[PDB]
Design a protein around this ligand. Sequence first.
Ligand SMILES: Cc1cc2nc3c(=O)[nH]c(=O)nc-3n(C[C@H](O)[C@H](O)[C@H](O)COP(=O)(O)OP(=O)(O)OC[C@H]3O[C@@H](n4cnc5c(N)ncnc54)[C@H](O)[C@@H]3O)c2cc1C
Ligand SMILES: Cc1cc2nc3c(=O)[nH]c(=O)nc-3n(C[C@H](O)[C@H](O)[C@H](O)COP(=O)(O)OP(=O)(O)OC[C@H]3O[C@@H](n4cnc5c(N)ncnc54)[C@H](O)[C@@H]3O)c2cc1C
Ligand SMILES: COc1cc(OC)nc(Oc2cccc(Oc3nc(OC)cc(OC)n3)c2C(=O)O)n1
Ligand SMILES: COc1cc(OC)nc(Oc2cccc(Oc3nc(OC)cc(OC)n3)c2C(=O)O)n1
Ligand SMILES: Cc1ncc(C[n+]2c([C@@](C)(O)OO)sc(CCOP(=O)(O)OP(=O)(O)O)c2C)c(N)n1
Ligand SMILES: Cc1ncc(C[n+]2c([C@@](C)(O)OO)sc(CCOP(=O)(O)OP(=O)(O)O)c2C)c(N)n1
Ligand SMILES: [Mg+2]
Ligand SMILES: [Mg+2]
Ligand SMILES: [Mg+2]
Ligand SMILES: [Mg+2]
Ligand SMILES: [Mg+2]
Ligand SMILES: [Mg+2]
Ligand SMILES: [Mg+2]
Ligand SMILES: [Mg+2]
Ligand SMILES: [Mg+2]
Lengths: 582, 582
Amino acid sequence: TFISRFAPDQPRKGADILVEALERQGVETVFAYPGGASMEIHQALTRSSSIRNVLPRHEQGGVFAAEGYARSSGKPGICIATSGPGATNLVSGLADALLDSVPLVAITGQVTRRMIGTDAFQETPIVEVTRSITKHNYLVMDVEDIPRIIEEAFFLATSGRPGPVLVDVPKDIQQQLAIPNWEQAMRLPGYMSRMPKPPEDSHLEQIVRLISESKKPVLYVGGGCLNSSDELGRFVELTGIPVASTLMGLGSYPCDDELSLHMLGMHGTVYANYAVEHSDLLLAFGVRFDDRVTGKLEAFASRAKIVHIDIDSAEIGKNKTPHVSVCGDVKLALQGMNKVLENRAEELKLDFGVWRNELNVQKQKFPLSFKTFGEAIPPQYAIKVLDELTDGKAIISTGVGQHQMWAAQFYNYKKPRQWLSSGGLGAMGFGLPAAIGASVANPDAIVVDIDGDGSFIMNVQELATIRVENLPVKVLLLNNQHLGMVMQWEDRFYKANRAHTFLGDPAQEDEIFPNMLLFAAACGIPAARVTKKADLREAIQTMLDTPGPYLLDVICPHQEHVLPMIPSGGTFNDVITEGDGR
Amino acid sequence: TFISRFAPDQPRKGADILVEALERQGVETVFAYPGGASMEIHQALTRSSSIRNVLPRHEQGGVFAAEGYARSSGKPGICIATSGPGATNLVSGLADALLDSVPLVAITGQVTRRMIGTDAFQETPIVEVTRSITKHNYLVMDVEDIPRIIEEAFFLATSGRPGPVLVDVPKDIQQQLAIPNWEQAMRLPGYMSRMPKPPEDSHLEQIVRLISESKKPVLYVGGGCLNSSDELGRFVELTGIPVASTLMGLGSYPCDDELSLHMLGMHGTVYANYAVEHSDLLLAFGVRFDDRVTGKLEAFASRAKIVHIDIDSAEIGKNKTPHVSVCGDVKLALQGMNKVLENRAEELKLDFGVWRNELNVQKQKFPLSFKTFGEAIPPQYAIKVLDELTDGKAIISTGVGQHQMWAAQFYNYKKPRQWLSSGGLGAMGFGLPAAIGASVANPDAIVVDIDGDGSFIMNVQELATIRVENLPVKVLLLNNQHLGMVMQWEDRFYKANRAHTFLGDPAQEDEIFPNMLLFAAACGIPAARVTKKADLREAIQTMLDTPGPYLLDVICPHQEHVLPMIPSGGTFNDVITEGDGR
Ligand SMILES: Cc1cc2nc3c(=O)[nH]c(=O)nc-3n(C[C@H](O)[C@H](O)[C@H](O)COP(=O)(O)OP(=O)(O)OC[C@H]3O[C@@H](n4cnc5c(N)ncnc54)[C@H](O)[C@@H]3O)c2cc1C
Ligand SMILES: Cc1cc2nc3c(=O)[nH]c(=O)nc-3n(C[C@H](O)[C@H](O)[C@H](O)COP(=O)(O)OP(=O)(O)OC[C@H]3O[C@@H](n4cnc5c(N)ncnc54)[C@H](O)[C@@H]3O)c2cc1C
Ligand SMILES: COc1cc(OC)nc(Oc2cccc(Oc3nc(OC)cc(OC)n3)c2C(=O)O)n1
Ligand SMILES: COc1cc(OC)nc(Oc2cccc(Oc3nc(OC)cc(OC)n3)c2C(=O)O)n1
Ligand SMILES: Cc1ncc(C[n+]2c([C@@](C)(O)OO)sc(CCOP(=O)(O)OP(=O)(O)O)c2C)c(N)n1
Ligand SMILES: Cc1ncc(C[n+]2c([C@@](C)(O)OO)sc(CCOP(=O)(O)OP(=O)(O)O)c2C)c(N)n1
Ligand SMILES: [Mg+2]
Ligand SMILES: [Mg+2]
Ligand SMILES: [Mg+2]
Ligand SMILES: [Mg+2]
Ligand SMILES: [Mg+2]
Ligand SMILES: [Mg+2]
Ligand SMILES: [Mg+2]
Ligand SMILES: [Mg+2]
Ligand SMILES: [Mg+2]
């Protein structure tokens, strides 16, 4: 039973109704940067005893923190910004949350209703701007609509295929007094009628039928399974089907497991892509057949009967056409199939040991590998050490590029929501703010941002946030002085012709530039650099053991390449397994 | 006569046609951050001998630098970004260029034409996103359209009311070979037919008629006069009409002049707003009657006959209704009126010395003023010293907030395009990147970014750009540890209740946090802090005299308030002339 801070017959500002609407949704933390058009909302926030604000240093930091909070917890992330430049600074995070299906509620102040459309001070038509990069959005045109719109926004952000919802609030509405009605019905008839039903036995029985008729089945699991860890693990017990995972799926099934093929796709393992190439049954659970995974679609799982279970009917049959499909929550489908697989266990007698052995041979002939050169630190190796000293139990966020691939390849995620990474939009500068949100949501966890030097500098101002919020964020900075992934493509496809990929100072080209230790020092954050592989284990242990935030600058030879690699639009037969920038 | 690097019968990549299209427009400098979907464009850029790239550390830095380049030079600023997160990171700069009418051409890489609409890797529907915040934009659907679209984009960005134009280029189009045709006609029939004619004598003669019948005329000049410095100065010679200027107009008429009323509006001088309040003729040249200037519209220039000259007919009669108008280039109108005023000089005998004296009394009773407390540095005073040691000849860029108002109030701009400031959107984080673009366009000028500690940290990563580009950018950081302007409004309208406006570390609240000197040190930029007013003159001289970039952290009491202040929607009779946070 909720207790308002206001008498139920007492008028209060729209801003106060908006904050109480958040309290009534269970919101505990928001990421809010104030300005003129949201001041009223900030004033109302100080009157709340149950909502904490984490002040970022840039609204892009605020929205990426909100995403970290959501991805690391399964709760919606809440960001708040002023009008105009506040709102436009959210845009990369909105697009990012929409592409990765992350639940987010973004609230923007706006000029007054009578000023809308007049090229007013700090006016942006943010509802127009963000229509194509949000799941839904709203312009509040009457203070009495605030309760319903906030309720609809959380409902839409968190139900179905999750995503971002933006709510735009004119300053005059924030100031208007009213008595809220907390019992209005949501006004979403179409969306609620198009919500998937629980899966039917008919369809689940057909999937189990297909499994029992198959000799080479592969599971293809993605971000849709992040709430299905238990059900999926049980399903693999009852079937012994080996598991390939997308970049968004990492940790749905444990990486340190004998049935795990690890990641498939452009930079997937040779054995994961082999499994899919030669499978005769493809169980695609919570995946969207993106071409970073599939390569050339006609060549992808070309001898497989394809089962697709997705909560979004628009995904089913979009790129690849399944033989069987379920439109619904993969968690319910797994539960239902598990009962069938348990009851008919002795009748079914499922054994894929011959397929599993065929894959385990590929696993032994073509494992993930890296070279050690003299005493230079291999980035791959630094991530393996971090895995060992954290016992695969850290929350890992990353930037985008080679280090992101290595954080996926060389750390064994044990649970979903340990891995926080921008996959569909691939936004640099995500890792540090995302780690801020993850640490706020999981204040007892080990939180490590595995970052690149180009990604890290983009939202470096959030080091200040980490300090004043006294968050124990660890930064494993893999520093190769380049835009590594663009550099790799220059090496393989442009004859190593460099086009603006070097991030250091060309006037002193053998100096580490910038000196990231001084960024940390500027914000009172302990830091160290490590250059020799022999010093790595101790350096990483110091970072872990030192209380509070810590930056470790890990210097890496820049000629490393992420392998394997299927070029864009290619087939398994195109996989590249050797080479680097030397 | 232009010399291609390609034979005129030789096919080359669309990327190479795009770069040569820029060369043919006279482009010398671009601000380009590479990614996968723009790599081809970056490769083609390295093949150009005439185009230099300035690599920013964040695309928001790139676009704000492009704006600095444009505002400081009168040329279009050119920024280039990859697809997806590259493109979304431009958005605040696009909206900013559209609100301040800054010419800008933004080029974004895009996924291939067949991938558009498939939720592809790093795909953003950027043409949809930016339609309402650009003057125009384009999606290139055929390599043969590149010459025409680039020509149209520069034409639209620079003609008429200038603004940003975005061009979105699919990666397959960048790779396609073709032979460009450099002689296609622009396809802009409607826009070119709606282009204003040279002003008619009928309308110019009526304006001079009104002047000669007036006893209290005021000039109200804005960003539209930035190319009319000579004509406007001559016009003031022939008429002796005193000049009030908007924040975007600063320097069109010299600040250090006896006829200058300085800035009008919410934070205008008492005498400028008085002049307008009591005028009987308002000459509104290159201004858009924004309500940061007008306050309550009915009360604004309520006894004046209003003349409005604007290049955009949509502005004429929008907010205030003129008695006379010219739709056209204010530079041509001034030239035309100057001939009339010269020929009929002895017949007209214009003398407003009685009005000018009435204003000069207001100038003496209510000048701009500040308090000095002990040995604390007044920010107002620090800007006056900078004015003196630079002889009012520096290019000044700023962030947004109190320091922005003080940079407008206490520096005497002598020419247009010395002042680079975000006025309509008011985007924090603009000052440092804008100074980068200004220094690249004016490599011999004194370039000073007068910044606040909240604005400065937002794009602090561009310190790296300044270093490797070896740009002599000076940073006068006015550091009050707060979001000053939001703090001021908290003081006057919310009983000093602080809602997330303190930027320092509350655990050690009397320490300067962060330590901006270490940000500069991280990027190899000389820096110093100054805290005592007696040390200010020397500290600023050191910054000016030390070659190359330099950061000066100027510590300021946070209780300062920008005065005067007409509250939003108010009238002259509401002006606030005293008070602060003490
Ligand atoms: C540099 C770089 C390289 C990359 N290379 C690779 C790569 O080699 N391999 C790779 O896998 N990725 C790679 N990507 C990531 C990539 O672009 C996509 O982000 C990823 O492939 C898509 O993940 P997904 O298929 O799991 O779909 P998601 O984006 O995770 O979407 C989840 C899907 O499940 C559905 N869903 C959600 N909830 C449920 C539910 N309860 N029940 C049923 N369905 C549900 C949604 O409707 C959607 O279809 C790379 C990214 C970058 C930046
Ligand atoms: C914190 C803050 C406080 C502010 N307070 C103030 C304030 O007290 N005073 C103030 O003035 N501003 C203030 N502003 C700035 C403000 O919001 C607007 O940016 C400014 O008032 C508008 O400038 P402008 O009228 O010159 O129009 P601009 O934005 O400069 O537009 C120029 C106008 O001229 C036209 N034009 C362009 N070229 C030509 C040409 N060749 N011939 C004819 N017409 C042309 C365009 O069509 C347009 O109508 C403040 C901003 C901030 C961030
Ligand atoms: C905190 O410092 C400042 C400064 C400033 O102008 C310099 N504005 C704002 O808030 C706004 C932000 C955006 C639009 C605004 O316009 C506005 N808002 C109103 O809300 C009631 C009324 C109004 O009357 C014109 N104008 C306003 C505004 O508060 O005027 N805050
Ligand atoms: C499927 O076939 C194609 C063809 C093509 O251009 C011919 N583009 C794309 O998608 C992209 C979309 C966006 C960026 C792209 O470049 C890119 N993609 C990467 O995927 C991980 C990495 C990378 O590193 C530089 N560049 C690519 C890219 O496939 O080149 N796919
Ligand atoms: C906001 C933004 N701008 C540009 C991007 C385009 N990309 C990339 C890619 C893969 O999307 O190909 O396009 S990755 C990348 C370079 C990575 O820099 P690093 O972290 O310091 O080095 P690391 O050694 O790769 O770990 C760029 C420039 C991007 N995604 N986001
Ligand atoms: C991207 C962005 N986010 C928030 C903004 C809303 N505003 C402002 C305003 C005037 O637009 O009122 O809204 S000014 C301001 C605080 C200024 O920080 P400072 O430079 O360190 O301190 P100074 O002492 O004022 O010089 C904020 C938070 C903004 N405009 N841009
Ligand atoms: Mg605002
Ligand atoms: Mg069947
Ligand atoms: Mg080793
Ligand atoms: Mg790097
Ligand atoms: Mg790209
Ligand atoms: Mg008349
Ligand atoms: Mg003094
Ligand atoms: Mg930044
Ligand atoms: Mg400040």
